[PDB]
A paper describes a structure:
All glycan-binding polyomaviruses analyzed to date engage oligosaccharide (glycan) structures featuring terminal sialic acids that in mammals are usually presented either on gangliosides, which are molecules composed of a glycosphingolipid, i.e., a ceramide and an oligosaccharide, or on glycoproteins, which contain mostly complex and branched oligosaccharides attached to amino acids during co- and posttranslational modification steps. These sialylated glycan structures interact with loop regions at the outer margin of the [name], at the apical surface of the polyomavirus capsid, as revealed by X-ray crystallography and cryoelectron microscopy. The [name] surface exhibits an astonishing plasticity, providing virus-specific interactions for a range of Neu5Ac linkage types and further specific characteristics of Neu5Ac-containing glycans.
As the Neu5Ac-binding site residues of NJPyV are highly conserved in ChPyV [name], we hypothesized that this virus is also able to bind 3′SL. With an RMSD of about 0.5 Å, the ChPyV [name] monomer superposes very well with a [name] monomer of the NJPyV [name]-3′SL complex structure, including the region that binds sialic acid in NJPyV. The putative ligand-binding sites are largely blocked in the ChPyV [name] crystals, preventing soaking with ligands. While the STD NMR difference spectrum of wild-type ChPyV [name] closely resembles that obtained for NJPyV [name], no saturation transfer was observed for the V78F mutant. We therefore conclude that ChPyV binds 3′SL in a manner that is identical to that observed for NJPyV. For NJPyV, this is demonstrated in solution by STD NMR spectroscopy of 3′SL binding to ChPyV [name] and by the structure determination of unliganded ChPyV [name].
Residue numbers in the entry:
A (entry chain AAA): 37 to 109, 114 to 322
B (entry chain BBB), E (entry chain DDD): 37 to 109, 115 to 322
C (entry chain EEE): 38 to 108, 114 to 322
D (entry chain CCC): 37 to 110, 116 to 321
């Protein structure tokens, strides 16, 4: 669409708010594993080699489409996302040093606190007028993944369909390994990144701090607004009067006392997005 | 309501100042545990599983309401424009002779104590009404002690989820909402500022986790925090009250005899500048 | 001589590409294809007890992109700005890395050590190949030779006698090259040359050590401006744009002997160009 | 005071420069302990419990009053506008041959010493009256030695709480207030700048704690600190006195024989620029 | 000199570029120790106590005077306005096969070497005359070796304090002053830029200490450092000389056999832009 003038006058703006709950692999507070909702299943070093890596061991992106007030119901209009407030909620919970099943931080014979949540932090949020474009990669192209119908997750080679001999290409950049973030708890973080070659109609912001013992470093405020306008002053334009929000917030890992295996911990993300009416020509 | 013009002229502005003392769990310098005022009770890895987690083992938010000069006695409200805030007693964190603290030296050494280090949780807020809180749990089935009168409130006190439903609290339970309306009552480990409310508050928060992290803190009187939003409107004080809230966990001390920890908190100063703002009811 | 910016329709263009990492195993083909995007294993005495191999030496990526052919006024493409991203940062959360050391005590079943340690990140956009300056940490390191050569070393150009090679631990002005070949110039021997690169813009950071947490951001909301203090960006000779990159994201540690491999990630570039009038 | 116009003309500005030497506890290069000037006395975990903690084990604030050119000879005050401040001798922190310092190597080794590292407390202040101080105790019942005359003042020297009320000092005791009116006298561990006062002072402070943390310090003559408030008004010098205050704990050394520590401080330079301000 | 107008005209500016090679102590790629050019000699904890500390064990400041085009053949001086500067060879710091370096693995492993890490000291200066230095000692009674002719100069070489007064040098001795007037002669561990002088120089310094700290270094040709003071005046080049100074310790290597260290330095590049300035004498 050709983008024309910002529409002025009353009822020219609106605001939408929502939460994305974390999809760390145990994605429902129902069923056998409900006690660990908001965490991954336990991961051991030879998972994906000695056995098939399960979807419940692979933190995934969160996403939602929000229905906007129907436009075009004079001038053809679309909702334009201009700015958002986003917040990781429950950061205070990460002070706990009495984590159930967690390794004790003390010498043998001590009675110390648990190790708290620490280690790799992966934080991303996106706002767009259509689903977020993803690019696939593998750290280990020959990782063994559990297979189900219906699929619980999608892997880059499910799309790229390289033969065993060509799958090492996935440790680099395989142009065919592309997808849209159209399903919540379905695309693993460890295999999918936002695609900087697309996303012309989305904005995304991410940080990663790696390692297993690194201090989680997180801020929270309602005083900071993220501007979603591009260099021409145009924000994401909401196709079908739909706003698409995407998130991933791995806040670290817990370490299990009995075998020192880990689980990822995620927190919910809040979004408040401000939108204005923009005139367009088809 | 509808905000109109900033009121100008003589006595159109005012300033308030106060201290919030830390509520790390031992919240009074009186009684059995008064020696540990400004610290938590000792915490061990199985507390809340093998026993009931005590209110005194849970660092809590500080809060106060400050009465302003009464207005309307043009409708007018006090509008908080800016504040100076400061953590006081940072230099006390240099101590390497902490009472009962683990020695930082090999066996047979005479080294210093481990100083205060590890997880830092710093938050201040200024608002025209109590700060909105959202409940969470790191572990939904943590066992909590029940004191008389009750010393803390927990998210499930409000959500009233059945034991099979409580794992919802590891995510976002919308019913688990409260207002920061009592000093030393809302635990930091279960309550966060609610970003879905707080339209009339400003909050600023930082967390650095782990047990060994260096506390990293600045102090100055040369920095002003602006409380105005994108429209140039600050918090509007309902009932001619200003609400201030804080949490400042500065780290942990480690006990020599069993390597259990206590949180350490420091007091926070606030100076808030306000101006009269015309409003339409 | 640089004249006015060209105005009007079709006065600008955009080009997009990916540079794949060249950490030493530079092809997903042959005996070592399973470690594409990683280096060969490195041990402390490699380059002393044996010849250091090209596959053990992370290298710069580069490509030349053909622009729309230009040519009233003579015209060059001028690189104004770019968006660049490291892609696949999410893959660095893996704690089940094949052959990696276990992060737990003997008798544990803990996760693998994740990728961590030294990060070397550089990107460059230029109207001609990036100028490089040669150095050696250890001037007498032994390097393997092949024909065709898999890498070029500063002394291949400087041609110092063995007694003079210690000069390469400082600054040897003759040890200069141009980044004209992808997966050829080792990071550990070649730096962007600050005495040239008049027609190139480069940006780099290094955080060293073997245990350091990788610290990486990714966004599409940040533009890097390529204009100099006079408002002139890279001017594209032969209607070619030259992009260069190095992204060492850290190392993996082998369970067997605690030897390491470097890990690199691909880098995306989008470069916005405008027509600049020039004279001669 | 009601503040009026800046006074312009010749002789309307002046510049003050001086050094504050560190007061880490060994506050003089004379006497039995002179070898450790610029360090604290050694500190053990049980000091203040098993024995009385000494003034020489407690880093203290540095301060000076500087007399300015007298005004209202026969209403004007000096206004501090800006300052350049520098920690001098930062290069000395590279030493890995510190006297009596723990060796950084395994038993059997001949490694370097541990260098200065761990908790860094850096503060400077410029004001037109003494810096206001608020008292606190990390441990309210710490036992302090009493010298004659007194070498330090403690918060309860002013608050005078009974031993049963002293745990109040682990929070905020409003009675525990003092002015930084004496060099090498106010312990950093018990006194902080009082943010409820200091309306006529500007202070700047950074702390990074722990025993293992790297010192992180900058030095330049290219940065000016502005002392003006939101109204463009700097500190106004009461009685034509400028007050400068500092604390620069750069880290600790570890003793080889018992692993006890001494704090190490460095001297701080100030250049303050002042102008005449009319006042009612 | 009273400073007047910037001189405009076609031949009113010039640009100089040069390298300063590192003086970590082994200061020439010739002689017995040429193999360790760009490093210090090995350093042990008791050096300067059980023995005389050698000049080759003490990182030193680099410096050069560049001859500018002669002016005054009305009265004029070269004014340094801005520079680009760069640490060259940062990529070399990825090496984990350092000759003679400690293995980063358990006994019986075959791990990589420990790479260059630990203390980073980075300083550059541009002046119209030699940089002013202030002397200090971490340990006033360190024993310095005394070569003929001297290979370094020590603060007490200028302050001439008796042994009983030398502890003054752990603070600030006003007499301990020098000018950075010789390449590889002034140890970093004893000499800092003098902030009480250097009215006609600009210096920029950073230090990160410890033995295990990751080097943290950037490189670009997109960053220009402005040398103009508050008044818009850059350094004025006395006798038509430009004075550049540097120190770039990038970390230490750790020896396998006894875990003694060597410092490692890298070369620094300078491009300085100068303009003609009128002055009055
Ligand atoms: Mg490919
Ligand atoms: Mg595109
Ligand atoms: Mg829910
Ligand atoms: Mg809301
Ligand atoms: Mg040379
Ligand atoms: Mg040049
Ligand atoms: Mg009190
Ligand atoms: Mg006050
Ligand atoms: Mg002196
Ligand atoms: Mg001076």
């Amino acid at each position: 669409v050709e983008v024309l003038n910002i529409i002025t006058g009353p009822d020219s703006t609106t605001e939408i708010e929502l939460y994305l709950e974390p999809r760390m692999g145990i994605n429902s507070p129902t069923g056998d594993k409900k006690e660990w909702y908001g965490y991954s299943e336990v991961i051991h070093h030879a998972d994906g080699y000695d056995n098939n890596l399960l979807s419940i061991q692979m933190p995934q992106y969160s996403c939602a489409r929000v229905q906007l007030p129907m436009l075009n119901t004079d001038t053809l209009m679309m909702w334009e996302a201009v700015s958002c407030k986003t917040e990781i909620v429950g950061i205070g919970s990460l002070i706990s040093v009495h984590l159930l099943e967690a390794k004790m931080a003390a010498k043998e014979g001590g009675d110390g606190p648990s190790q708290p949540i620490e280690g790799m932090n992966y934080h991303m949020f996106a706002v767009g007028g259509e689903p977020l474009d993803l690019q696939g990669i593998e750290s280990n192209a020959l990782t063994k993944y559990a297979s189900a119908i219906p699929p619980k997750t999608i892997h880059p080679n499910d799309i790229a369909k390289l033969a065993e001999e060509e799958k090492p290409q996935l440790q680099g950049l395989v142009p065919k390994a592309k997808a849209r973030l159209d399903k919540d708890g379905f695309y693993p973080i460890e295999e999918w990144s936002p695609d900087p070659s697309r996303n012309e109609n989305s904005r995304y912001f991410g940080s990663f701090v790696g390692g297993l013992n690194t201090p989680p470093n997180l801020q929270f405020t309602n005083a900071v607004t993220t501007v979603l306008l591009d260099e021409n002053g145009v924000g994401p334009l909401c196709k079908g009067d739909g706003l698409f929000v995407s998130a991933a917030d791995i806040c670290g890992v817990m370490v299990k006392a009995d075998n020192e295996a880990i689980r990822y911990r995620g927190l919910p993300r809040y979004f408040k997005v401000t939108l204005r009416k923009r005139a367009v020509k088809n």
